[model samples]
Target: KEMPQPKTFGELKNLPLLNTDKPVQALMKIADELGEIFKFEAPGRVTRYLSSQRLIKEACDESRFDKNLSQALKFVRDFAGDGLFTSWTHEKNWKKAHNILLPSFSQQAMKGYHAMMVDIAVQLVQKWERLNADEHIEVPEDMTRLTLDTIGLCGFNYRFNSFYRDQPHPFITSMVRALDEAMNKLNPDDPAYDENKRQFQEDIKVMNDLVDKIIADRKASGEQSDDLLTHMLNGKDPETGEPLDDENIRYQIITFLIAGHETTSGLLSFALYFLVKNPHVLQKAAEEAARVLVDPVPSYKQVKQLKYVGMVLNEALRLWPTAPAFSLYAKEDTVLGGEYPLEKGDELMVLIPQLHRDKTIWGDDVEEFRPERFENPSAIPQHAFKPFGNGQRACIGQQFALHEATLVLGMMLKHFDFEDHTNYELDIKETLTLKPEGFVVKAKSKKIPL
Candidate 1:
């Protein structure tokens, strides 16, 4: 049945959206008021926000809905052209790129990347070792450096080496500005738009400058390996038997960084957050990592055995799904939640924070940090829990993110104990991704290392 929204006047229709910093919290309240589905009316446009498992499942039904490059993603297209993350669902390259790169993330590929992933994790540990135990590591920033270097090294063998820099790599500041403006979106008629547009262009150039060199270097060396760049350069689409254009290759490189970086960065932060917050889980996770990670740089087989630690990450994602919302559009006129009439062009935002907390699905302890919920994977209902996203258009890097996280996290837990001086709550920071805001934890080493 259609749920009634709160009354609104013309100028105030977007009051809920006015505080753009915490869009999730504000919209979560709107979801509470309206329930199931709520629509935002803004003169010429209506945006629907969904917050229920049933409606989210309905939204996932491919027959009725299609993933659209919402303004947030469309904004990224300038930075990452028709790359997989920013490409239209209808774009042929989506299939071409998907098919060509699908093999790169196979179990065999993960085994190959384990050394590269370990290289970055070792760098991360060294940087922390350079600090005093009381230096108080900023969780998200080091995690960002770890992930950026790992993806750059593993994705194409370009070394961002963000751990070496006192500040973030020049790429991060520029990328953050672009993504920040992308989320803040444009109000073209405002006199402020042109100035910010200039800023975004500068940022775009900084980002593409990195991607361009990556492409040109690979082409110049004429090197061949099992990396992502090699596949794009040498492999053909399984279906149509075509290679990606040079322009598309450039876009794909930037897209891998743009899409994969912060999503997993913030995810690892939340995992660490929950680990510190829940003592027993931290103890259990640490013991599992210590027992399995016999070597300083764990073998791929050893990391795969950290099931309890994997469960810790899964539970963190359950509470704070890092890429917090995704947008979709209607294919035809349809009734959402069996009552709200949605038109052909209507766009809907699925607020994952609320969806992840649905009391009906998660039960009385919806707010608890319970890793046990994931103890048996097959027992959970399908489509009820999607941190990466839902269905075929879900994150292509799902396995990469999980494997990288499990390895890095398993290593971190084995070596250090996090001291959360803030006794932190989930104070979130919103970028293109959501993160635990300004969260810092001190590291106390549990073992003397090699």
Candidate 2:
């Protein structure tokens, strides 16, 4: 028989405490309970896979996942058996987390995003150039594809070759499909378990094959590349002090493909959604862009001054966070949030969506899409708004994500403009991260009078 799922934080102490809100609390608790039963067979006897504890931590921690990726891969390869999914999990894994990876990896990744965005902008501009004035150009059809291509080149330092001059890259297309399938199985209630799991594993195999080929080529030709793979390959193991091997390098690449691709796409999707709904914020975004970017291309240095745009991004994150819930089973019966007895195997989920929307923390305008609320957001408690997450496990690539969005938005203002056509829809779903549905937008050059 299934354990009774908690419906509120009070009940969740027996399971996983969700956010302060009761309904979300109920939904997550139930989901988690179902997950345990579904995944439970015999822990040691069943096939184990790779995963981490970030989700186990409640929301709002800037989880330094990238810093931990290489280490995570090592753990997964050693301990992970054939499970539904694979992840890097080890106790000593935390030691190498974020220590050796260069601080500049984030900066370089941002520059890459800017470059990819330029490619997209030029593609848009070129499309419009050949079209008649009355003809419509669909530059925003595949927003995720655009961002993914940028991340692949800039973050990984390898061209996904997605958005090949005239069409989509087959590899990129397959990888995306695989990622979608793999992430869909995270849900315990989704009925497509057998089929979804198979498809996801196939995707992983395909991606692994691609990574293997790349690693082999780099090794044989003694070629030097500046992407994250190179960083992992050359960077010594924090523990063994050995160079990362093919499997080690591939794991980190898979991590990047998974982490870098989804989070940014969802964030940009929601940012556009809120910007469209609130003309004032959109106008302010344009105002900031106009004030900061007076040239054909904006530089990374200019992003800091886009104060209002930053607030807009923050507000969007608050409303629609990338991963709204995180969970962690008690390490050994500890206390959290000043109360709640945590048993040895008790799972606790920290809900960001509920906390983010909390009226007590965000004040009266919690539901409103007001960027002004963030003017002095520090005035709020630390636990209130944790989009990238918080604590020791917070996101390592946050700096990169912020820089990417800022640079891309700034450049778009310089060359192209985003207008909200009704085709714009916001669909919020969670896979490996929170995904927005119908993440579509229309693009027009700033040269065109609007």
Candidate 3:
């Protein structure tokens, strides 16, 4: 019972346990004062937040704590039903899908998508190349376009061509509304709009219809290309040899786009934020990209060597993990950090920002954006850098996001010099994932002779 439970108003009710606008940032401040493990008491439940490496490992062990879809993820299930993102850890489809899509619905997904991935990367470069000089680009929005298009083209041979659009594609619009309302439901104040629920239903139908059409076209076109969609359609669980049903297949693809798009977009967004914030880092990163990508389009082999840019991406994820926090459910009564008590069903929210910036592991320059910390990647303390997430259920798209981010970043830096024209101080707005609010930047095409 060594943990402190502050209640100035006492017993029944006290001031809000966290800042309304920036609960994540507030958690960091509280973690600083509360140390390794602490709890926040709500009326019916207790949510614990952890900040130490030792505690992270202890809690992450599957035996002690298991995956619990957080509130947003649960509501996400409304549309993304029984998909990998929303499935219970023990659900058969979760394991079935996991095994069937073990290497993202067959082993060749990463390499197979390389050409398609580059196709979209070049599209972004060309867009910047042709845009009027000094035209401000919303970093997050463009990155979102890039990621959504990348997933569409690479995973399913569909083209969102989001860069060419004035607003996002219709699927993007509806998905955004669905996700926004999910977050709305999470608010204690019950911030609901009369239209949001109906809008969400319609939005879900729009996204589902779009995906269905994509699947139907591929099947109807008699395209024999072996892509993610093809694999999911034909994939069978190796252990049981059972194929994924159509509904689950649809959910998995929805999971692929939803889980893959925003988080990776946020990663690229934050990476650009850091790059433009620190000119020295930007110069070194651009130099590394230029040096490595001597050819106009880097081959699969060449992409692996953009070491420094990869480091910068790593640093950005550490600073601002897009999928900020996830919950762990304790199945049995247990004590945390030797003092905090928990009964079965209690949930612990793994504070990725707080855990990443723990002073003990990251040093006094905890807030600084430094890529060199990952220079000797192995040296980073275990269980510390969890931007993607923890354990077996960690993001399935971790490599996919990293490879794409590094490649697009490499391509962007080599072709254009960026200026953070907005001079935006970091203001984050969370819908389902963390993203810098209104972050805008400018690009100049710096012609290079190869």
Candidate 4:
């Protein structure tokens, strides 16, 4: 009861929504947990229950999802079956085929990983510093740009410069626009449902065609690529997986870009918001950053040594998960928490915010913005702290995202001090990605540590 609970979702319906709300809700539940853990009897009960919509949300919850690993591997079958991503109307493998076409997140792919992120961060920091050459620095409105740029260089070897003033390339704009339109049309809110479907289908065709062109261009005599596309085209998964071709490469690219750029950007903005609200935590992070980063910026090795910094970021993720809740479709009749009776074809959702803020797991001080809670994290239970999804369905890019965040935040804290411009309201805005809303803050350069 911190904030007024809505009398009903209908009462608050159409309110300006924020993505972090879900993650924050999860955190609040854990924070409010007086001391009780919800238990499940079966191994795949949660997943199975989620597969069915009758006992759950066959008629509600727009997001389509399947259970953890049980339904995770079903990607192969689902793509070939009646699943939306597969679409019997389309009669093509869109999900599984793409991944199988791409290279696994391999050790070699991780070769320049740390360096790529650090290098991109270095460039961005330098640019930011130059832009604020002599003024009372204000908040940068383009963090999405910063993170996307980082992802481009480190992940794709391209330039989105979404942070910079000028617009992005035509191809980039076209691709992003198509993606946005496709996602919107597929959404259940489509008043012109059939029209939305037609638009989505057309968008996919365009995207597929564009991707094919890019593949052809890259494979031409002297063309080169250092992004995920090149890696997928050339590299094979270390474990029995085959090398990715054009079609598979496209899906992974889209997934990575959306995941890589959006989540990190939102989490960083949330981290800033939380830090400003609780200056105590910000100071602690700054102190840690100063101690670890002696030079103009923190190196990969230095970022690794920022243990307390790591704790702070971890705490933020717990408090404001990037991908907060999960939606799943049930495969058969099952029971969950020994409470909800689920029937086949039901859709169930785990409100990660509810779970994150569960009183049973996070303790009564769950809502408190205290980073030290993680100092003795063993008190928190397992499977209860999933900002990313759980088990095999967990994010493939978790480690990559974590490293990028630590590096970028470490650099920011080392040089710039952000102040509360939004008055701790956390001007949060929601897109397909979670954002800090209308995050506007004031920032000042800190004294360089000698």
Per-residue lDDT tens digits for candidate 2, residues 1-450, read 323333323422433332332334354334434432212112121111111222223212222121122222233332222110133234333334344454535655555445555665454345544555544433334445656766666545566554455555655656667655433332544675767556656666777788778888777876656456556556765666755556655655665555666677677667777877788788888888888876555655677678888888888888767766544444455443233344554444455665565554567776789988889867856566677755555666677677766665555555555666656565556555676665555566667321
Alpha-carbon runs more than 4 Å astray in model 2:
1-94, 102-141, 165-168, 184-201, 237-240, 376-380, 423-425, 448-450
Q: Per-model C-alpha lDDT, please?
A: 0.83, 0.55, 0.83, 0.56
What are the per-model numbers of colliding residue pairs? 0, 24, 1, 41
In candidate 3, what are the lDDT values of residues 1-450, reduced to their tens digit? 766544534543323665476788877777888777777775555677887877887888888899998878999999899988899988889988888777763324677778888988888788777788557788888888999898887677778778878977888788777877777787333455556767887998998898888787876877766467887877789877898887787788788888989899999999999999999999999988878898968777778899999899999988888888889999899987676778899888898888888877899898899999999999998898999787878888888888899889989899888887768899987666889989988898787532
lDDT by residue (90-201, candidate 4, tens digit) is 2243334334432335434444567777666776566556655444333334556666677666655666655454776444555556555543432365576776456555
Query: Judged by lDDT, which candidate is best?
Result: 1
Q: What is the lDDT of residue 242 in candidate 2?
A: 59
lDDT per residue as tens, model 1, 287-323: 9988998886888899889999888888888888989
In model 4, state the lDDT of residue 300: 62
**Candidate whose TM-score is highest:** 1
RMSD of each: 1.9, 7.7, 2.3, 8.1
Residue 56 in model 1: shift from native, Å? Answer: 1.4
